[PDB]
Design a protein around this ligand. Structure first.
Ligand SMILES: OC[C@H](NC[C@H]1NC[C@H](O)[C@@H]1O)c1ccccc1
Ligand SMILES: *[C@@H]1O[C@H](CO)[C@@H](O)[C@H](O)[C@H]1NC(C)=O
Ligand SMILES: [Zn+2]
Length: 1014
């Protein structure tokens, strides 16, 4: 295994180093506004060295943005595809590339057989070529790598089945900045090349000057280079026709033949395209070939890529004709005039890359190596696209909840083969496809119109119900004596209980377990653990009595704690935000111990009085002028007091101190240690009253944030043996700090209400001497070092926080893990900050056509880990990566893949069993089974199950942590007959494994295996 910590890779371009050296000056470069006047030696190309030009027709089809997916399909995409089929069939030299498989599958299944066969023919002959082949062209900032793989697999599995092709070249022309997680996943999925477009205009200029726009993109920790993927970065401001033929859009726009008037389009540079004729073809060719030769100066080979397309292009038949005929006339002229020394033709993306690599093999070019990312993107001036790291945070959090539900449903149901009548494959395909659709670069990004966001939310709600159905049917089958099991596949044997989604204060949707002497004495509950190691974790349920005790299925008592159910209300009468306790339901909390990838059953039983193994939390309401808070049968009376500082400690864990406003002030790790200043604060950013306005995409603050005025907020302290908390009702945020014995959990119920032009940020202030350095993750896969640059504006120092961020000095580290992607930064030494929500009245001129005024309450979740790190083996100062400790990684897993909870719905569960998976191997803490998916339906004689295994890299800090079992996924199901290593999409077999044993992977590596069973 490669060492991902101690060996600094030697690369030609390292993006953090490049950023430190770059000046980022925004000067007028002439017709190429953000470049320079390109010059070329006309004698560079001659009869023996011609410029080979591939014009690649394309149509960017957003799966929802200004219209829903189905609205665009009906108005535009179905016509684009039907006309592409007709025009390509009739014009054999014409070509077209297609990226979004969600639309292609929607179209193809509506075709008659005659057309399906014609379509397969133009794909097989190479005229219509799929690029990337994912369900969507995903966002690369907020998306989790597991969902990027899910959607790539959904589209490519569909393509292999119906079109018999698997793309090896990727096309990503629109995500707003680019992540190295993409080449990581693509290179492990058979890809050989990729293309990107939205990178900072200053980066395009810098790399263009050094002819470093094509590079071998490797991961930041990859010393050897085995993760490298050839990457082409386009050079100009847009992927539209005016910015793809060459440096001068006033000239290129004249070669977009859809802009002459009848289509309702024009050229903003005021010179319209003109129909090519025999009397103007020589002059038109001389203008066009000159743009091509200028663009070719920015690259190292004599093979030039010229994309020809834009949003929802190639719809009407007249448009296919106007572009095709005019370009055919230009090609016939240019290719016949030796003096140009050009051979131009329509081509596909793969054809371009194959020709570039033929040039490379002929020794005509060597390509530079590069590592790093391409965030934060700016397309012009100070317009940095860091707003979409937070926009529509409700749905960003929903994405992570559905991510987990899809994994758990696919894993729980994979253990068995299911009859078709159970509709298991049907519900899983629906869930995978709705979650995959939301990875679109206007879905999770929060950049679609309000009714489109509603469509995505409705689709995800249906996917969550599909997952619950599959999960609960699986649990009933796995835990019921086989000869008693009698399923009704439409019945709800269990309901899922989720404590953090939508969340307390967001939706009252959790069911109360109703017990009573005259109705039902007890209730079985089951926990599932999708991670491949034993896990203990506190779980909670709502119950109708405080006198409840817990037992495991061997009837062993389990210690429990009961607390009230508190809800916060904005009292319009008193103009205060305060808590009300339920007088009819209570929370019971206890530790569940669940096997690796397994299930554990517990029983909740009511009694007439306080049971022996259940304790009751105390509750203290701090506010002046308190009023009574009755709690029904709860046995401890609520206590009251004036606001005051307080300290809490659960178990042997840390001791946390809080201000009189209910916000953390310090953390003391152990009895002896110091009380380390760690202060939470809420602040607000505004919008500029002159100049450019923030919107769904852009973050353009009107200076540093200002503190939210807190008033004298009401603070609620609940102190229990197993779980304690401090909750405070602040303006727009009910902030909670929860302690269960280790790193605290923070929950924010964020309701920005009607505060227009406001962004609410949560900041942590510490005295960690971090300087200008901080770390943020990329797609939940890796942590990259960031350096705050005062030469760039505040919004440029904001980065995606898809799952965590940290700051550290020689001795101390503070890590903040998240349960949802949000934007954040470290704007001063010792600080961390993460945006909670933003409400913006204005459109930001990127096409959305509205502000962001559809905010809704969202429950954001986090874990806060303060640790000593002076004994940890960390990368050297020049290494561009950082790595989590064991505790921070486990805290992240606690947020993203919690135990699932099931409440048996009926009164008695006949044949109930107490555990499943007790014999599953408990793997090393850094290894995860990211995906377990049965790949065959019940009629297959040889069943196949796919596994994706991911091993992260945790810092060595002197904590032995030993005795773990080897995990061989190929023997998890019985009767294995074959074990193969495959690409991550499971579509290609790479290695037949000896002994049918799937070896574990190296740190920072991800591998896929398929086991076959007889
Ligand atoms: O190339 C045309 C450009 N496309 C914008 C892309 N980014 C946001 C969406 O995903 C859209 O595809 C545009 C289209 C419409 C209005 C403004 C700009
Ligand atoms: C699928 O593509 C392969 C290319 O290697 C070809 O050999 C195979 O026959 C194709 N299957 C069909 C006919 O769909
Ligand atoms: Zn787009």
């Amino acid at each position: 295994c490669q060492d991902v910590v101690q060996d600094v890779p030697n690369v030609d371009v390292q993006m953090l180093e490049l950023y430190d050296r770059m000046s980022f000056k925004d000067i007028d470069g002439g017709v190429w506004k953000q470049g320079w006047n390109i010059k070329y030696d006309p004698l560079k190309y001659n009869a023996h060295h011609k410029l080979k030009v591939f014009v690649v027709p394309h149509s960017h089809n957003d799966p929802g943005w200004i219209q829903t997916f189905e609205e665009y399909y009906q108005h535009d995409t179905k016509h684009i595809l039907s006309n592409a089929l007709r025009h390509l069939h009739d014009n054999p030299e014409m070509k077209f590339i297609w990226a979004e498989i969600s639309y292609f599958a929607r179209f193809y299944h509506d075709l008659g057989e005659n057309k399906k066969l014609q379509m397969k023919s133009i794909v097989k002959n190479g005229q219509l070529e799929f690029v990337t082949g994912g369900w969507v062209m995903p966002d690369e900032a907020n998306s989790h790598w597991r969902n990027v793989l899910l959607q790539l697999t959904e589209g490519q599995t569909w393509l292999k089945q119906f079109m018999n092709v698997t793309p090896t070249a990727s096309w990503a022309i629109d995500p707003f900045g680019h992540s190295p997680t993409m080449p990581y996943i693509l290179q492990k999925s058979g890809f050989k090349n990729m293309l990107i477009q939205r990178t900072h205009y200053s980066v395009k200029k810098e790399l263009a000057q050094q002819r470093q726009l094509e590079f071998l993109w490797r991961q930041i920790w990859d010393n050897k280079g085995d993760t490298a993927l050839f990457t082409h970065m386009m050079p100009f401001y847009s992927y539209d026709i005016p910015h793809t033929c060459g440096p001068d859009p006033k000239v290129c726009c004249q070669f977009d033949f859809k802009r002459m008037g009848s289509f309702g389009l024009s050229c903003p540079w005021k010179v319209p395209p003109r129909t090519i004729s025999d009397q103007n073809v020589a002059a038109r060719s001389d203008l066009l070939v000159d743009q091509w030769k200028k663009k070719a100066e920015l690259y190292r080979t004599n093979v030039l890529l010229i994309p020809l397309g834009d949003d929802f292009r190639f719809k009407q038949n007249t448009e296919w004709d106007v572009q095709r005929v005019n370009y055919e006339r230009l090609f016939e002229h240019i290719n016949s005039q030796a003096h140009f020394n050009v051979q131009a033709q329509f081509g596909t993306l793969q054809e371009y890359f194959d020709a570039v690599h033929q040039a490379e093999r002929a020794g005509q070019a060597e390509f530079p190596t590069l590592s790093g990312d391409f965030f934060t993107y700016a397309d012009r001036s100070d317009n940095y696209w860091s707003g979409y790291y937070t926009s529509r945070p409700y749905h960003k959090r929903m994405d992570r909840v559905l991510m987990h539900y899809v994994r758990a449903a696919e894993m729980l149901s994979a253990w068995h083969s299911w009859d078709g009548m159970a509709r298991i494959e049907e519900r899983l395909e629906q869930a995978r496809r709705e979650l995959s659709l939301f990875q679109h670069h206007d879905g999770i990004t929060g950049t679609a119109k309000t009714h489109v966001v509603v469509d995505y939310e409705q689709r995800m709600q249906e996917a969550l119900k599909a997952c619950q159905m599959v999960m609960q049917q699986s649990v009933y089958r796995l835990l019921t004596k086989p000869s008693i099991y009698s399923p009704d596949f439409s019945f709800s044997y269990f309901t899922l209980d989720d404590s953090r989604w939508p969340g307390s204060g967001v939706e009252d949707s959790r069911t109360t377990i109703i017990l009573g002497e005259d109705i039902l004495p007890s209730k079985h509950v089951v926990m599932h653990n999708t991670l491949p190691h034993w896990r203990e974790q506190l779980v909670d349920f709502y119950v109708s009595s405080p006198f409840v005790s817990v037992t495991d299925l061997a009837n062993n008592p389990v210690e429990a704690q009961v607390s009230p159910v508190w809800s916060w209300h904005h009292d319009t009468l008193t103009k205060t935000i305060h808590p009300q306790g339920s007088t009819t339901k209570y929370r019971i909390i206890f530790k569940a111990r669940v096997p690796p990838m397994g299930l554990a059953t517990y029983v909740l039983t009511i009694s007439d009085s306080k049971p022996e193994h259940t304790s009751y939390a105390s509750n203290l309401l701090l506010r002046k002028n308190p009023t009574s808070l009755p709690l029904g049968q709860y046995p401890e009376d609520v206590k009251f007091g004036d606001p005051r500082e307080i300290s809490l400690r659960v178990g042997n864990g840390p001791t946390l101190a809080f201000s009189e406003q209910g916000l953390l002030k310090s953390i003391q790790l152990t009895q002896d240690s110091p009380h380390v200043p760690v202060h939470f604060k809420f602040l607000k950013y505004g919008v500029r009253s002159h100049g450019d306005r923030s919107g769904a995409y852009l973050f353009l603050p009107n200076g540093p944030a200002s503190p939210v005025e807190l008033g004298q907020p009401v603070v609620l302290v609940t102190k229990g043996k197993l779980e304690s908390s401090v909750s405070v009702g602040l303006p727009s945020v009910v902030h909670q700090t929860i302690m269960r014995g280790g790193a605290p959990e923070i929950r924010n119920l964020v309701d920005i209400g009607s505060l227009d032009n406001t962004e609410i940020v949560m900041r942590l202030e510490t005295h960690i001497d971090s300087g200008d350095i901080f770390y943020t993750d990329l797609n939940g896969l890796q942590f990259i070092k960031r350096r705050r640059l005062d030469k760039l504006p505040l919004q440029a120092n904001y980065y995606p926080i898809p799952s965590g961020m940290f700051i550290e000095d020689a001795n101390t580290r503070l890590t903040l893990l998240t349960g949802q992607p949000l934007g954040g930064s470290s704007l001063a030494s010792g600080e961390l900050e993460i945006m909670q929500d933003r409400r913006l009245a204005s459109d930001d001129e990127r096409g959305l056509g509205q502000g962001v005024l559809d905010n809704k309450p969202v429950l954001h979740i986090y874990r806060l880990v303060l640790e000593k790190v002076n004994n940890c083996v960390r990368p050297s100062k020049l290494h561009p990566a950082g790595y989590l400790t064991s505790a921070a990684h486990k805290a992240s897993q606690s947020l993203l893949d919690p135990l699932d909870k099931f409440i048996f719905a009926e009164n008695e569960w006949i044949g109930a069993q107490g555990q499943f998976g007790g014999d599953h191997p408990s793997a090393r803490e850094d290894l995860d089974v990211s995906v377990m998916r049965r790949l065959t339906k019940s009629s297959a004689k040889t069943q196949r199950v796919g596994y994706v295994l991911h091993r992260t890299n945790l810092m060595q800090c002197g904590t032995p942590e030993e005795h773990t079992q080897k995990l061989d996924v190929c023997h998890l199901l019985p009767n294995v007959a074959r074990c193969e290593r495959t690409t991550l999409t499971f579509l290609q077999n790479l290695e037949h494994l000896d002994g049918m044993v799937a070896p574990e992977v190296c740190p920072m590596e991800t591998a896929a295996y398929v086991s076959s069973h007889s």
